[PDB]
Amino acid sequence: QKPFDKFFMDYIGPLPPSQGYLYVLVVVDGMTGFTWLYPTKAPSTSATVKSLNVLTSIAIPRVIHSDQGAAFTSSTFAEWAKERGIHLEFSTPYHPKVERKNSDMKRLLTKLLVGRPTKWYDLLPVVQLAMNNTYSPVLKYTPHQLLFGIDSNTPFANQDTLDLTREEELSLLQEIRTSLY
Amino acid sequence: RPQKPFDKFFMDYIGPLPPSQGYLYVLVVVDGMTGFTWLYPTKAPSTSATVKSLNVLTSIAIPRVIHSDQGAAFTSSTFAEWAKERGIHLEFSTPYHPKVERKNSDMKRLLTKLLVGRPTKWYDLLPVVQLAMNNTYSPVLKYTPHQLLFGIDSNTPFANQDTLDLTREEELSLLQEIRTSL
Ligand SMILES: [Mg+2]
Ligand SMILES: [Mg+2]
């Protein structure tokens, strides 16, 4: 299994409106557990296409898994997916623990963002950062080092703090580091 | 070149471009060390589009330095507040202080021509442009930018390295035209 092999995709929201954004598109790499978080104004197909255009600038996934929300089962999205040889796979009642982690993550994510009603847009990058750079007892590593190579030139100076200075950021990093698993 | 990934970004807008799907500019962000390039379509070369694009990019990591010219999008009170907060140092081209400046400038001309050459479809093709760029061998660093950012001995997420899994006519054309100039 490669990285960028299979994406797990879902929306959280509606959240308190931080700077005209209400939702977050949560994309999770199946192999690495690396999470990309995209703020959106609506859980639309257009918003999803915009977000995934940016993500798929890096690599085109083999499979994208989502529930059967309107944004994902629209024909526009199917067309978008077909155009680039992406196969969409949907949550059904009958086809196959990965979800258990994603559910728990999406729950923490919602708690973190709802709790910062005014600033969550601004701190969204901090949340992704802290999450992808927190250690997993199942992965033996962090999602970041799994994506960017285990022994690789790390883009961080203080692993204690991940180069976060302000107390909003630190209290956030704490909460994630502690509550994640 | 600087020490590590994310030490230094070079940032600039290209355009105006032929209005494709409501977009008119591209924010070009280049990592100093790796040469990795991120392309972000916007409707304006504005502060808010930059902050919005860079918030995505900097979810990966916070750069120590961003270098840019004195475009209004970069010199605004709002953008300065954004950087001071994220802890990023902004470094501008000045009359006193304009090697790898030629690389960036050439690349930004190439990009403008590729996108203006595809007046109504450049927006849809941007991901192809970015992907092609970061996965083409660089004579200057013996590797591809993707290799330098994601790992020399990381397994490439592509089956065929000559085509990079690309099938469409207008898309293989781009990979060809980019593989020439770079
Ligand atoms: Mg859902
Ligand atoms: Mg300029």
JSON list of C-alpha atoms in Angstrom, two decimals, chain A residues 47-107:
[
{"chain": "A", "resi": 47, "resn": "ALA", "atom": "CA", "xyz": [-16.21, 23.24, -2.53]},
{"chain": "A", "resi": 48, "resn": "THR", "atom": "CA", "xyz": [-15.04, 19.60, -2.62]},
{"chain": "A", "resi": 49, "resn": "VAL", "atom": "CA", "xyz": [-13.72, 19.90, -6.17]},
{"chain": "A", "resi": 50, "resn": "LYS", "atom": "CA", "xyz": [-11.86, 23.14, -5.26]},
{"chain": "A", "resi": 51, "resn": "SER", "atom": "CA", "xyz": [-10.32, 21.53, -2.23]},
{"chain": "A", "resi": 52, "resn": "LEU", "atom": "CA", "xyz": [-9.34, 18.32, -3.98]},
{"chain": "A", "resi": 53, "resn": "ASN", "atom": "CA", "xyz": [-7.92, 20.21, -6.97]},
{"chain": "A", "resi": 54, "resn": "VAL", "atom": "CA", "xyz": [-5.37, 21.68, -4.55]},
{"chain": "A", "resi": 55, "resn": "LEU", "atom": "CA", "xyz": [-4.76, 18.30, -2.88]},
{"chain": "A", "resi": 56, "resn": "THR", "atom": "CA", "xyz": [-4.48, 16.34, -6.14]},
{"chain": "A", "resi": 57, "resn": "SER", "atom": "CA", "xyz": [-1.86, 18.85, -7.33]},
{"chain": "A", "resi": 58, "resn": "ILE", "atom": "CA", "xyz": [0.49, 16.77, -5.15]},
{"chain": "A", "resi": 59, "resn": "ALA", "atom": "CA", "xyz": [-0.67, 13.26, -6.24]},
{"chain": "A", "resi": 60, "resn": "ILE", "atom": "CA", "xyz": [-3.74, 11.65, -7.82]},
{"chain": "A", "resi": 61, "resn": "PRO", "atom": "CA", "xyz": [-5.31, 9.04, -5.46]},
{"chain": "A", "resi": 62, "resn": "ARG", "atom": "CA", "xyz": [-6.47, 5.59, -6.64]},
{"chain": "A", "resi": 63, "resn": "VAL", "atom": "CA", "xyz": [-9.62, 5.51, -4.49]},
{"chain": "A", "resi": 64, "resn": "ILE", "atom": "CA", "xyz": [-11.62, 8.08, -2.52]},
{"chain": "A", "resi": 65, "resn": "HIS", "atom": "CA", "xyz": [-13.96, 6.74, 0.18]},
{"chain": "A", "resi": 66, "resn": "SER", "atom": "CA", "xyz": [-16.88, 8.77, 1.51]},
{"chain": "A", "resi": 67, "resn": "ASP", "atom": "CA", "xyz": [-20.41, 8.41, 2.85]},
{"chain": "A", "resi": 68, "resn": "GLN", "atom": "CA", "xyz": [-23.26, 9.03, 0.40]},
{"chain": "A", "resi": 69, "resn": "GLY", "atom": "CA", "xyz": [-23.68, 12.77, 1.17]},
{"chain": "A", "resi": 70, "resn": "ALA", "atom": "CA", "xyz": [-25.03, 14.85, -1.73]},
{"chain": "A", "resi": 71, "resn": "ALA", "atom": "CA", "xyz": [-21.65, 16.47, -2.56]},
{"chain": "A", "resi": 72, "resn": "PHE", "atom": "CA", "xyz": [-20.07, 13.04, -3.17]},
{"chain": "A", "resi": 73, "resn": "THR", "atom": "CA", "xyz": [-22.83, 11.26, -5.13]},
{"chain": "A", "resi": 74, "resn": "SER", "atom": "CA", "xyz": [-23.63, 14.17, -7.45]},
{"chain": "A", "resi": 75, "resn": "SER", "atom": "CA", "xyz": [-22.88, 13.41, -11.09]},
{"chain": "A", "resi": 76, "resn": "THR", "atom": "CA", "xyz": [-20.61, 16.48, -11.32]},
{"chain": "A", "resi": 77, "resn": "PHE", "atom": "CA", "xyz": [-18.32, 14.92, -8.72]},
{"chain": "A", "resi": 78, "resn": "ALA", "atom": "CA", "xyz": [-18.49, 11.51, -10.40]},
{"chain": "A", "resi": 79, "resn": "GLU", "atom": "CA", "xyz": [-17.51, 13.21, -13.67]},
{"chain": "A", "resi": 80, "resn": "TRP", "atom": "CA", "xyz": [-14.69, 15.09, -11.94]},
{"chain": "A", "resi": 81, "resn": "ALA", "atom": "CA", "xyz": [-13.53, 11.74, -10.51]},
{"chain": "A", "resi": 82, "resn": "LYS", "atom": "CA", "xyz": [-13.86, 9.89, -13.83]},
{"chain": "A", "resi": 83, "resn": "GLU", "atom": "CA", "xyz": [-11.92, 12.62, -15.68]},
{"chain": "A", "resi": 84, "resn": "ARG", "atom": "CA", "xyz": [-8.82, 11.69, -13.65]},
{"chain": "A", "resi": 85, "resn": "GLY", "atom": "CA", "xyz": [-9.26, 7.92, -13.21]},
{"chain": "A", "resi": 86, "resn": "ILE", "atom": "CA", "xyz": [-10.35, 8.26, -9.60]},
{"chain": "A", "resi": 87, "resn": "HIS", "atom": "CA", "xyz": [-12.62, 5.49, -8.32]},
{"chain": "A", "resi": 88, "resn": "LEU", "atom": "CA", "xyz": [-15.22, 6.49, -5.74]},
{"chain": "A", "resi": 89, "resn": "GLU", "atom": "CA", "xyz": [-16.18, 4.01, -3.05]},
{"chain": "A", "resi": 90, "resn": "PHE", "atom": "CA", "xyz": [-19.18, 4.62, -0.82]},
{"chain": "A", "resi": 91, "resn": "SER", "atom": "CA", "xyz": [-20.28, 3.65, 2.67]},
{"chain": "A", "resi": 92, "resn": "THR", "atom": "CA", "xyz": [-23.00, 1.01, 2.21]},
{"chain": "A", "resi": 93, "resn": "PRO", "atom": "CA", "xyz": [-24.59, -1.16, 4.89]},
{"chain": "A", "resi": 94, "resn": "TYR", "atom": "CA", "xyz": [-22.80, -4.27, 3.57]},
{"chain": "A", "resi": 95, "resn": "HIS", "atom": "CA", "xyz": [-19.13, -3.60, 2.66]},
{"chain": "A", "resi": 96, "resn": "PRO", "atom": "CA", "xyz": [-16.36, -3.64, 5.38]},
{"chain": "A", "resi": 97, "resn": "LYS", "atom": "CA", "xyz": [-11.68, -0.27, 12.38]},
{"chain": "A", "resi": 98, "resn": "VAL", "atom": "CA", "xyz": [-10.26, 2.55, 10.22]},
{"chain": "A", "resi": 99, "resn": "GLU", "atom": "CA", "xyz": [-13.62, 4.31, 10.57]},
{"chain": "A", "resi": 100, "resn": "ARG", "atom": "CA", "xyz": [-13.42, 4.01, 14.39]},
{"chain": "A", "resi": 101, "resn": "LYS", "atom": "CA", "xyz": [-10.28, 6.19, 14.36]},
{"chain": "A", "resi": 102, "resn": "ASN", "atom": "CA", "xyz": [-11.67, 8.62, 11.76]},
{"chain": "A", "resi": 103, "resn": "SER", "atom": "CA", "xyz": [-14.92, 8.98, 13.73]},
{"chain": "A", "resi": 104, "resn": "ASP", "atom": "CA", "xyz": [-12.96, 9.68, 16.92]},
{"chain": "A", "resi": 105, "resn": "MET", "atom": "CA", "xyz": [-10.76, 12.18, 15.05]},
{"chain": "A", "resi": 106, "resn": "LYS", "atom": "CA", "xyz": [-13.77, 13.97, 13.48]},
{"chain": "A", "resi": 107, "resn": "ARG", "atom": "CA", "xyz": [-15.29, 14.14, 16.98]}
]
